[PDB]
Amino acid sequence: ILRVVTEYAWQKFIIFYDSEYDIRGIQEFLDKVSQQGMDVALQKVENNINKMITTLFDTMRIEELNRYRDTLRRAILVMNPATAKSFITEVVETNLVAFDCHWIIINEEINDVDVQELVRRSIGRLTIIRQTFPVPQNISQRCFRGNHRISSTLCDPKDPFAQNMEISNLYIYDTVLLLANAFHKKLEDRKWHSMASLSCIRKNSKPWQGGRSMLETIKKGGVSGLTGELEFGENGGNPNVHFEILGTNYGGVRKLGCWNPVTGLNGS
Amino acid sequence: ILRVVTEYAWQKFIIFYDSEYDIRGIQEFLDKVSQQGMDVALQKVENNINKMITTLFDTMRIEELNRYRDTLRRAILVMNPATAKSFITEVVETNLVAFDCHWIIINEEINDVDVQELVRRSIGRLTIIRQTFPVPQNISQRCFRG
Ligand SMILES: [Ca+2]
Numbered sequence A: 001i002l003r004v005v006t007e008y009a010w011q012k013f014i015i016f017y018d019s020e021y022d023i024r025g026i027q028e029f030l031d032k033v034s035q036q037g038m039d040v041a042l043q044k045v046e047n048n049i050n051k052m053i054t055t056l057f058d059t060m061r062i063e064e065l066n067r068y069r070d071t072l073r074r075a076i077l078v079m080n081p082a083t084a085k086s087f088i089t090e091v092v093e094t095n096l097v098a099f100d101c102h103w104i105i106i107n108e109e110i111n112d113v114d115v116q117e118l119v120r121r122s123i124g125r126l127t128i129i130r131q132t133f134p135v136p137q138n139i140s141q142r143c144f145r146g147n148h149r150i151s152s153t154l155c156d157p158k159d160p161f162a163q164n165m166e167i168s169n170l171y172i173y174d175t176v177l178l179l180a181n182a183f184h185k186k187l188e189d190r191k192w193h194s195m196a197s198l199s200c201i202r203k204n205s206k207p208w209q210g211g212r213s214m215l216e217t218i219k220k221g222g223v224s225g226l227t228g229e230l231e232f233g234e235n236g237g238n239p240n241v242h243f244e245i246l247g248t249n250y251g252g253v254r255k256l257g258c259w260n261p262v263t264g265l266n267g268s
Numbered sequence B: 001i002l003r004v005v006t007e008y009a010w011q012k013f014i015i016f017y018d019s020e021y022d023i024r025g026i027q028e029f030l031d032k033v034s035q036q037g038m039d040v041a042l043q044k045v046e047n048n049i050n051k052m053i054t055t056l057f058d059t060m061r062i063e064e065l066n067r068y069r070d071t072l073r074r075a076i077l078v079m080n081p082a083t084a085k086s087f088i089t090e091v092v093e094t095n096l097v098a099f100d101c102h103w104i105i106i107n108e109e110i111n112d113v114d115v116q117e118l119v120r121r122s123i124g125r126l127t128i129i130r131q132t133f134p135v136p137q138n139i140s141q142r143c144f145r146g
């Protein structure tokens, strides 16, 4: 979000977040914008937008709303798409934004149906930032990885399930996939160590003697799945991630660029 | 509608009407705009807007839609408010109109709830023309006549 904001040369904008978001996620962002001397407002968006905005007009006086309108010309939404949809509509309909506004929505999880609906509801420039998964061309090969066949319900992107999957769902698939390959290699190499029946609340209880070798095998595993490549670095965490950046100035959405943490930003 | 159009100095605009409207109602209007040399398009709006506009983008090519977009900058809606609501939203969301547009809605019957909702849905200038009834001040005397 910092990189994108920097590219647009924003100096003044408002960050909107939903009622479940943990703002520690942007503590580093807030530090940096302050360090660069920007004017950044924060507001939590209640889950019922209708009473929020109605309350606003009543509560706030004219000169405040004029200040508020100006502030909304540049905004970042850090919220789930459902709340964002409702929020965008209500501000638009109540004339709190206009054609010159530019809003950014950022969330790993925004599906194609959500993106289309957000664009439909917005009336200025909109930028959408979401995580994307490297998936093959030729729709037929989308449902295979080598000889491994994936249920069409997960890989057919015309499928309602597929279009409604949570990101965690994709990772769950690849996790099962990764484990299977880990077990396979361990079995094939004839270096199997059996599972053990363990006991928890027993300060005497011992750990699984097989755990260290299994962990090492899984940790050094890698598979191609629905998320792209799943694998682990030396620190035990998946390093692979990709973000796409979508846009539309109104008057329809297109790809502006891509981001990943090694190469950085590509495109405008 | 003629008087209002004359006041705004329109020279080119499109008239949209719903599927129940009897266009003989505007035959005299059409005569007069033609006599003044205006460029006036007519289209019936089907009762399901969603398939109408979807059909449109598929059916029509680019250069037609550009012609069409330009034409929609000035429009008159001669339809019931329910159909107008849906119609305004769908054109707005599909970027067939923009901030510079000016639309007129005319119907004797458009209640206060409809008016508020139309304004909410529109994104340019909107003019609403409806019949009104002279009703007393002091809400108490509204419910009496003598
Ligand atoms: Ca739109």
Ligand SMILES: [Ca+2]
Pocket (backbone or CB within 6 Å): A092, A093, A094, A095, B119, B120, B121, B122, B123
């Ligand atoms: Ca409006």
